[PDB]
Design a protein around this ligand. Structure first.
Ligand code: CL
Ligand code: CL
Ligand code: CL
Ligand code: CL
Ligand code: MG
Ligand code: MG
Ligand code: MG
Lengths: 253, 256, 254, 253
């Protein structure tokens, strides 16, 4: 099915050296995309690139700090110079910080906003600058269940992801007319290392299973279909949507 | 060129209601191309036959399954025939529904009811019948067809708006009850699409200009542009997606 | 008083107000100053509620009719017209609950939920709106549910009907706001009423409500009153097509 | 009526020297609340306080830059010392900045985020710390139609207001159990000096009237009912909700 094929396209996935970003990058590569691996640690990025190459994927290392405008600008300039077009941007980079709001230092709030929200804006804007003259491109922002429903102790993350949902709509509002589709994925509770602490908590584990209609956690590879869909011609008239991949959790009391 | 398999529908049988023409036909053809066996359903049996034949000529496995989507007896009867034939309905696309344009202060209750019955009640009855076979098997996909009016109202199309809003909530209710048995119930909300059901809107320059101005993509959608979403929601690619409505509207719903 | 929340001089029809939440809201509107048209299916129950309202100083009239009967709805408004009684405020509160898994759900029970909740609100809203329009002002307050937004197993037809109510509210705004009519909705969460007695008397369900709600408690019937008055008053003249969830924060958190 | 009465309560409205904030503060005063007026121009704040006192309202100036954490903290310390409780907080302060994203400077993006979103978090956090031991409080964040629907050229405002909506829910998530209701108002197109460029653009004016079911702009005082509702006992069981006051605009195509 050509409509899901990504051959001839290049995807930059931020924070793809590990975790969900890597699982999505891997799935995009299987669908045919060349992959630009990104992460803060150059050595960790390089290791992930070699592993992608070892299984026959076309991959390049594009390490940069997603909170640094100058590094973002220089990374895209370097890509321009090598003749590498970024056709698909997945804004996956982001951190979590657990603390009740009355105990939350403004500096930590700010770090979560910068890493999750401002990063997506800066990187999205740089990608779009080049996609616009080409007349096509895909932007896939990674939100969260907290883009819509709040949870105690994760306020700055919740706010940043709520911002990401609206950033997605703002991107569609301005860029859809130029043939660019900006959409989002909202992962539910996934079996991934960032969640290991939650997964290890028997009470939290029980809550996830009782709160989710599917009665189970999601696996990281279960984000791949949605990521491929939103990166492929299959979603050419889809714009400004956030698709939750959460076993039904957001849909029910 | 990619050998990925998460979008393949081989071995699955899809029933698409109102698939003899329009968006339903386009989605049915898309499902067939992805590998699904197709059951075509429609009012005009002549239009149905022509559609089934056209599917067969291009190598699709297709068949007519006749029933009034508003008739419970006809629905239960149709599923009985499928049951005996060992046909599993693995994918149900609830696309059947009519439109009726009339301001509410002039709207006869009988026209209100017909819109509700054909759009909303049909989806409940047919979804209920499909699910009781899906549950024991432990897998299944239900794709309801909503509308932009599942979310935003428009003057003169109230009963449709109400029915499509119901469809969105019906989708969530289905996820609530069936997700645990391995069934994914999701929905598609087509925007303004180039179909004959909208020809009166397309051939009005004011409304045409409005669509292009109101939509960020600045264009109407083509029926084929629902295929990707329909296949995605019918395939293993969406196994952990439940209760979602995905709008295919060039961004119309996302902006002022 | 606070004049923007005053309903003096205005007349409110509240369907299903002979008892339960409908009665509590009708009483709230009366306290706010509205003359109340009490409605229910039983004329005797309706009249008794009317007399109780009047004995504590509220003005109230008996307007019994079956909300699923179009001919009775039309007949009732014809009576009101002839008396010169304007319906300035309509609260569509009537509607039944029916709990049953969808695979066990008879279509007739589904239909009764749809008719009593959704079709009734359309028919009555339509009759009210055509008299409000030439006056250039009016309020329609539909009663949704927190299930207008989020579903729950065993309550599909109610969820669907109330989801319909949310969109009906928006459809009413779309057509009638231009004429100075505001159509809005209330989505109650879990309320300590008699139609929820089973839920309330179930320790597992009671515990779930208290744990699932940020406010860690059920709502009281009186806690809908403020929203009903707000949406019935001058205070909400630029508010249209809104549904206000009164649910202790349930819909807003995981 | 008692359920809308604010007697015995004190409300802090940020950016209430003029515009929407001033209109809401006046309605809160009419409802019985003691009012704390805040704004950047000390003369305009003092003049507004005077006008409130002329009609018998209890009003007082409370000075702080809403983007300065130290000034916010000091302001609440002065309130504590004077025995002034903030029972009701209306986070109304904010700025607008119009510019397409590809041309938007990050510094401007950041100033809009800080002024609209971070401000509401810092001030809400400071207010909540006092409301919690009292077992009572109302927080009303001021969102926008852009909390829900995007518009080209106002992306950082859109994102900030989307953040406001989710912040409101995060507040409900952590604080509802302590008897604090956190909710939001999303004003539609209102006739304020801040909007005077749009109002005076005949194309934008005609668009508002055609796009709004009510076919008209809102007047600032039309926010009063919603503000009082969300500040009074009438909304004791309302938490985490945003109420749009937009003549129906968000509700229709
Ligand atoms: Cl996995
Ligand atoms: Cl097509
Ligand atoms: Cl009765
Ligand atoms: Cl004003
Ligand atoms: Mg098979
Ligand atoms: Mg009158
Ligand atoms: Mg006073």
């Amino acid at each position: 099915q050509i409509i899901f094929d990504l051959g001839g396209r290049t995807a930059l996935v931020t924070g793809s050296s590990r975790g969900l970003g890597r699982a999505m990058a891997e799935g995009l590569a299987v669908a045919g995309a060349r992959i630009l691996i990104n992460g803060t640690d150059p050595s960790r990025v390089a290791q992930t690139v070699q592993e992608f190459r070892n299984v026959g994927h076309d991959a390049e290392a594009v390490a940069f700090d997603v909170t640094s405008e100058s590094e973002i600008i220089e990374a895209f300039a370097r890509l321009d110079e090598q003749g590498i077009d970024v056709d698909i941007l997945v804004n996956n980079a982001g951190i979590q910080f657990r603390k009740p709001m009355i105990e939350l230092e403004t500096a930590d709030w700010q770090r979560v906003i910068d890493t999750n929200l401002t990063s997506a804006f800066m990187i999205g804007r740089e990608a779009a600058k080049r996609m616009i003259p080409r007349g096509y491109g895909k932007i896939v922002n990674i939100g969260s269940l907290t883009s819509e429903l709040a949870r105690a102790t994760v306020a700055p993350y919740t706010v940043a992801k709520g911002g990401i949902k609206m950033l997605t709509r703002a991107m569609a509002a301005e860029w859809a007319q130029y043939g660019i589709q900006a959409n989002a994925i909202g992962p539910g509770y996934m079996l991934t290392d960032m969640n290991q602490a939650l997964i290890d908590n028997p009470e939290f584990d029980a809550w996830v299973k009782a709160r989710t209609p599917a009665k189970r956690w999601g696996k990281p590879q279960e984000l791949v279909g949605t990521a491929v869909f939103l990166s492929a011609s299959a979603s050419d008239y889809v714009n400004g949507q956030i698709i939750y991949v959460d076993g039904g959790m957001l849909s029910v009391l």
